[PDB]
Structures are given as C-alpha cells and as structure tokens.
Design a protein around this ligand. Structure first.
Ligand SMILES: Cc1cc2nc3c(=O)[nH]c(=O)nc-3n(C[C@H](O)[C@H](O)[C@H](O)COP(=O)(O)O)c2cc1C
Ligand SMILES: Cc1cc2nc3c(=O)[nH]c(=O)nc-3n(C[C@H](O)[C@H](O)[C@H](O)COP(=O)(O)O)c2cc1C
Lengths: 200, 200
C-alpha cells in the first residue's frame, strides 16, 4: 500500500513522536518494501491558521477569492488529495496544553470540508475519507491514558471518525517529563506497539 | 470588580459568541457600573502560533532570545498580567472541528507557563491564576451538550483548572446550523443564562 506520515511536534529532532514516526517508517520499509511512503512535517512545512478570510476559501462558491483564499484553497485541495491517495495514515499527535499541537490542528482545519471529506445526509453527517487504517502516535509528558485529562484521544477519534476514518489504533508514549529513563521506557513500549501493528 | 472578555470567533460581526459576549458586557455595565471592562479580540488582535522558536521564549533562561522570542515573551507577559489583573474572566469559545478556535488556543499556549501561571509541587501541579470567576460562552452548530462529542467543555475545564481557574460556569448556544429560528432560540436561552450569572 501507500503510507502517509504526518508529523506535528514543534521540537524537531528532539521530538519523541517524530523518533517514533521514524521508527514506524523503518519498520514498514523493512516488512513491506514495495510500499511508498510520504512524510509531511506540519512543523517544517507549516499550514496557516484558519482565520476569517481563509474560511471563505473552504466554502463552495462562485464569488472571487482573494489571493490568500486562492492559495489556501489550493493548499486545502493538495492536503486532501494526499490524504485520499494513501491507505495507512500515521498521525503524530504530541499533547501540548491538553490539546494537540496547533500545527496538526491547522491541517485538520483545512482538511475538514463539506462535500469533500464529509457530506450531510438524511442519516446524519457522513465521512468521505473511506477505506483507511489510521495509527495515532501520541506522546505526553505526564500520564493521562484512560483517565479524564486525556481529551486528546477522544477528540482524535471523534474528528477522524467524522471524516470517515473510523479504524484508528492509538500508540502511547507517556511519562516523558519524568526524565530520560521514563522517556526510554515510553519509547520501548511504544515501539513494541508499533511492531505488532506493522507485523499484523 | 474588573471583567475580562476574550473573544475568539473568526466570524467577526456575524459571530454568535461575540453577540453573546457583547450582551454580557451590556448587562454587566448596567448592573455593576463602577466596574471596568476589558475586551481582547484574539481574532482582530491575533496571538502567534506556538512553534519551535517561540516555545523557547516561555522557558526561564539566561540564554539570549531571538527578536521573535523577545516579542513573544513580552506578549506572553502582557497576556498574563492582564489575566491576573481581572476578577471575572469571560471566554467566548466557539467550536470549530470539535476543538476550540486556533485563535483561543494560541492565547492559551502563551498563557500556560511553568512558574508563572502554574508550578510543580510535592502535591501535584498547582495553579497560580487564583481567586477568579470564569464564564465560558460556547456556541456550536450542532447539538453536543452532555454528550460524547463535546470535548470542548471538559478541555476548557481541564485547562482552566490547571492554571488555577476552577470556578467555571458554562453557557451554551447550540443548534446554530439549523437556521435562524434555532440560532434565535440559542441566543435567547444563552442570554437568560447570562442574566442569572450577572444578577447572582
Ligand atoms: C508547549 C508544551 C506543552 C505541553 N503540555 C503538556 C501537557 O498538557 N501534558 C503533558 O502531559 N505534557 C505536556 N508537554 C510535554 C509533551 O507532551 C512531551 O514533551 C511530549 O514528548 C511532546 O511530544 P514531542 O516530543 O513529539 O514533541 C508539553 C510540552 C510543551 C513543549
Ligand atoms: C471552521 C468551522 C468549523 C465548525 N465546526 C463545527 C463543529 O465541529 N461542530 C459544530 O457543532 N459546529 C461547527 N461549526 C459551527 C459553529 O460552531 C457555529 O457556527 C458557531 O455559531 C460558531 O460560533 P461563532 O458564530 O461565535 O463563530 C463550525 C463552523 C466553522 C466556520
């Protein structure tokens, strides 16, 4: 198949989720070497903030668009085509201030578009990005998993399910802020979880 | 007292949460006319995205800061001083793509700072923005309240509680996307909720 890797950390080479994404990539190339892999780093190639002007680019219109709107529309179309073009979608979602990173959020805000990645319907909202497996690699400083301060995990499930990606496996790298021994254990635990997704 | 109003809609004068924030303001001036009121529109006066460079401004250091870091630090300090300087904090939090707006998020990402608005401690993390009443005015297109697709409400409670704002009252303006009759009912329901916060 084709694997999409989205990175969203603001910590570059020091990023725990990026080191895990990279590992994922190495393991996929090893086991499934026909497959092509695309990596988009939403920190190194930043998506603009959704503001009052750019939101108009995302609505179906025959009104003229400002230069920024045109650019934001073309960038929207490129992100969505890329997303639809891949089978396995890997999303690094570090938690910052109990949310995902703004770098990832801006990608979602350009990707969620009525009549393109979802559509309204007699029988509720329906997702149009179909037939995908998503793996979410989520790194955190503290320990949040299965608890009430983990809003990141239910939100990703909600947003991805919305646009049609309902097959999502979460990999967790938690306790990073406790120091290098805990960071190393997180990496080792998370790497075993990846190993079994890849070898399934 | 002193009332802080934060607006975060990208829809300007057409914004439901901004029309409610405005109403809040009129009612507070009416009942408590000694009080001063500050309004910061985080869409009209945008906070920058937290990236790899700006995050360094928010860590206590004696390393030289780049021009952007300096600017982001001064802007951080101005936002936090303002927040600490007010008694009642009103936050318009429209839901976009199951999250708050990026405009609000960027404010939070500059406001959440170790040793300034929170501090670590034997007995867990502890909030340093203390003694505040928060009112959150949250507008949505659909109907989410008390259900599993409402991640916005638990996240605001979590983030605000984290920095010490644990007294939070939510006002809801839902079903906006069903049209002007539902939008008008939402406004009327939300306005009664505000009336009883103000008159308490
Ligand atoms: C701006 C910022 C905010 C953070 N907020 C949280 C937080 O809400 N909860 C948490 O458990 N860790 C928090 N952390 C720690 C990160 O989740 C941890 O460093 C994680 O490894 C980040 O993923 P990454 O290294 O891929 O960037 C924060 C780190 C930064 C830089
Ligand atoms: C970019 C965008 C995304 C939206 N996503 C949601 C959504 O996730 N759920 C929802 O119920 N309504 C959604 N809406 C509808 C808004 O929540 C509704 O229009 C609300 O009134 C916005 O608050 P405001 O008018 O103050 O901007 C969205 C609107 C926009 C423009």
């Amino acid at each position: 198949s084709k694997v999409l890797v989205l990175k969203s950390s603001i910590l570059a080479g020091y990023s725990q989720s990026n080191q895990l994404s990279d590992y994922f990539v190495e393991q996929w190339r090893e086991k499934h070497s026909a497959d092509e892999i695309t990596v988009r780093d939403l920190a190194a190639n930043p998506i603009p903030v959704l503001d009052g002007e750019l939101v108009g680019a995302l609505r179906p219109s025959d009104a003229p668009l400002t230069p920024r709107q045109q650019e934001a529309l073309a960038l929207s179309d490129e992100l969505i085509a890329e997303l639809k073009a891949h089978d396995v979608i890997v999303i690094a979602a570090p938690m910052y201030n109990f949310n995902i990173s703004t770098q990832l959020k801006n990608y979602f805000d350009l990707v969620a578009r009525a009549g393109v990645t979802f559509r309204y319907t007699e029988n509720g909202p329906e997702g149009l990005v179909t037939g995908k497996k998503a793996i979410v690699i989520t790194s955190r400083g503290g320990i949040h998993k299965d608890g009430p301060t983990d809003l990141v995990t239910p939100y990703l499930s909600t947003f991805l399910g919305f646009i049609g990606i309902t097959d999502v496996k979460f990999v967790f790298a938690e306790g990073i802020a406790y120091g290098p021994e805990m960071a190393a254990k997180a990496q080792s635990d998370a790497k075993a979880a990846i190993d079994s997704i890849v070898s399934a």
